[PDB]
Ligand binder design. Structure first.
Ligand SMILES: Nc1ncnc2c1ncn2[C@@H]1O[C@H](COP(=O)(O)OP(=O)(O)O)[C@@H](O)[C@H]1O
Ligand SMILES: Nc1ncnc2c1ncn2[C@@H]1O[C@H](COP(=O)(O)OP(=O)(O)O)[C@@H](O)[C@H]1O
Lengths: 370, 48, 37, 370
């Protein structure tokens, strides 16, 4: 026995949510809380001091933004409860919580303590009847409806590649990199001070993030493309100010393939990705050549998959046809896939009742992990 | 509380108090005054 | 209103506008197939 | 008490006062000192040797004029005592110094010693049930009904602009110039002897005030009006004589925009206010372009607004719509806002027991004002 569950597609930057069997996440709001810088002695103005969404984005000025979650590992768990309480807002739910099944998201390569504390929240502070969350890549595959695939997510500062054969991942061939657009914008901030500009405020930095997402693409041959002169079509701020560009429009996003240039013993998404592919079956790579699942919204770049095709030619196999799946609802793919799963009578076997948590809890977490 | 309002015998009364206690578990989700909570504790003692 | 209030003291923007103003002015295509043969 | 606390428009040039709920500061008078200039010998003359009221500003040639306020801050506390006695006159109150709470006004960026000194007098001389003093800027928006906005006052003590975001003040962004119309009168006296006009007396000074507020005006064009061939209109003196005018009628208020001509280093009220805008957030300034509030008696000029608008036009950012208010009562409104504040039951923190002041002092009030 249950109610209609809700799929909460936790984007590393923007969390999303929405009831079962639907097509579009009901809510789409980010992951940070602002608190006012200035206080007042005046009587009659606003209250709250904790805002997320249009309230925060509305009056960004005093609300000092702080991202509580880092690579899934959140440190403001209490504030996450407040965030989920905000998910239970009047404008948000007006529903109950201890009487409905739900669905959140889970990326791999994580400490169990996160799931442990999560169960503590939803089953100590809440009394959720049944709830089970699994690997996000399968949800993307649900959106595809394709047995095998190479899913690559793209969070704000989180990325990971997973190959799955008919609903079976490869634990010995799954990789992850701790970065996405987060340090890309931070690196753009670096470029800003490289040519003398600081955008040290939190909101200011998110504005920089929006600028990045607004004007950035991929180049063909980076060192050869460096030989030209960027004309820097200046954009003009909401404040009304000159915005130069530099190589940032193409150089800054390729930091992903130059972690040594940023200071990290890593190689590249496609590099370690194809390495894990090499660790897979001699035969399944053939399937994965056409089964290339693109996911995550950080992927929005001109010639993104095209430069990725160039990367494929860099890591060329022994002449075998390859194909990439590049949909348009890559962020929504996981939410919709969960909605598909949430629209299944198979969750009876795929769930864990709260009574099970009452009986064991931690042991149910360890044993009934997946 | 309607269970105690219609309480008849030891088994029903006792188990009703058990269910009452399980509902009393909402303090972690309410933050109600400790002293007023104690008033309720002895109130239930008087009711019992 | 404050009309007799205005009759008492003289600090009223009489025959003058109270507002001044700076006037008006006039996709992800899939199938990236690396056909390697 | 269940009645009206003492509302005092603590005015720089002209101090006014009245009570809560009322919309008329019942008593208004400048911040001068009226003692005599001669010695009565005849038995049956007028006496008192300290005069306020119209009789004081009647026999100017017989009454020594001594303005006791300096930059909006008095230093002649004895005169303030006598002033408050005149405030307590039968023509005014017939009350006690204990029957009602006292509300006074101030300007920021002042020594706390003033507040100290003040309360010391207010409780050693009076036994006030509750005393409170604050910024009229809050009261100003109360009069406008707004929440945010920047207000620049132009009194004869200090001209200062305050940016306001719903009362959440930005102490690092407030500007305060210590100029007055008094200096413009002095400057006019300079023009007098330039034009050959023998004036040095304190009595003449008030006549110059009448000239200032009546014969002077504002020339919108800065240097185009500087080269205008004057006609030297003649003002018929109240005693019965007549004196020419010249281009000085608009030259003198431009010193407020070019303080360096007198030697005072500043940047002009307009630019100073723009710098205050510059000491803030980015897009919140966009609101402030619409949020423009005028204040102060030293604003009533023929040509004032539009000239100041042109100043703003030169200080304008890149193509941003700007709205500029202009209240009628650029002074009285503050008193009325104080009457509104006094009409509040939420005046809790503001009402302070005298015993509390005995226990701590002005520091206790500093905690409230800070
Ligand atoms: N124009 C754009 N170019 C690149 N990235 C973008 C653009 N617009 C939005 N994004 C990205 O969409 C991504 C959504 O990330 P997130 O919701 O954290 O993904 P995930 O669901 O994989 O965690 C963000 O990382 C943000 O940088
Ligand atoms: N009609 C007027 N025209 C120009 N200036 C005026 C007029 N009336 C008052 N003022 C100016 O107001 C100043 C008096 O300070 P004021 O604005 O009264 O501050 P407060 O009300 O705080 O005393 C004087 O410098 C005087 O020139």
């Amino acid at each position: 026995i249950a109610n209609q569950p809700v799929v909460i597609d936790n984007g590393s930057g923007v969390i999303k949510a929405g009831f079962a069997g639907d097509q579009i996440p009901k809510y789409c709001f980010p992951n940070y809380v602002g608190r006012p810088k200035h206080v007042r002695v005046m009587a009659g103005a606003l209250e709250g001091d904790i805002f997320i969404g249009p309230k925060a984005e509305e009056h960004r000025g005093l609300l000092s933004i702080r991202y509580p979650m880092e690579h899934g590992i959140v440190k403001d768990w209490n504030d996450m409860e407040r965030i989920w309480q905000y998910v239970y807002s009047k404008d948000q739910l007006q529903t109950f919580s201890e009487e409905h099944p739900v669905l959140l998201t889970e990326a791999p390569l994580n400490p169990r303590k996160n799931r442990e504390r999560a169960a503590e929240v939803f089953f100590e502070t809440f009394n959720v009847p049944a709830l089970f969350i699994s690997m996000q890549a399968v949800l993307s595959l649900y959106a595809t409806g394709r047995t095998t695939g190479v899913v690559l997510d793209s969070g704000d500062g989180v990325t990971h590649a997973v190959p799955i054969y008919e609903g079976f991942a490869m634990p010995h061939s799954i990789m992850r990199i701790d970065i996405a657009g987060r340090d890309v914008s931070r690196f753009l901030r670096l470029y800003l001070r490289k040519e003398g500009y600081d955008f040290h405020s939190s909101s200011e930095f998110e504005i920089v993030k929006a600028i990045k997402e607004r004007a950035c693409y991929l180049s063909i041959n980076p060192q050869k493309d460096e030989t030209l002169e960027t004309e820097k079509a200046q954009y003009y701020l909401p404040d009304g100010s000159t915005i130069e560009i530099g190589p940032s429009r193409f150089r800054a996003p390729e930091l992903l393939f130059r972690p040594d240039l940023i200071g990290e013993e890593s190689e590249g998404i496609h590099e370690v990705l194809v390495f894990a592919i090499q660790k897979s079956d001699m035969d399944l790579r053939r399937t994965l050549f056409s089964n290339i699942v693109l996911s995550g919204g950080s992927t929005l770049f001109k010639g993104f998959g095209d430069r990725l095709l160039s990367e494929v030619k860099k890591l060329a196999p022994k002449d075998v046809k390859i194909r990439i799946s590049a949909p348009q609802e890559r962020l929504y793919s996981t939410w919709i896939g969960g909605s598909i799963l949430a629209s299944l009578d198979t969750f009876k076997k795929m769930w864990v009742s709260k009574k099970e948590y009452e009986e064991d809890g931690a042991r149910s977490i360890h044993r009934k992990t997946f | 509380l309607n269970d105690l309002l219609s309480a008849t015998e030891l088994d029903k009364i006792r188990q009703a108090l058990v269910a009452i206690f399980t509902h009393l578990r909402k303090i972690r989700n309410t933050k109600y005054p400790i002293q007023r909570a104690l008033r309720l504790v002895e109130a239930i003692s008087r009711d019992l | 209103m404050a009309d007799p209030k205005y009759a008492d003291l003289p600090g009223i923007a009489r025959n003058e506008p109270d507002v001044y103003e700076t006037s008006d002015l006039p996709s992800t295509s899939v199938e990236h197939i690396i056909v390697n043969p």
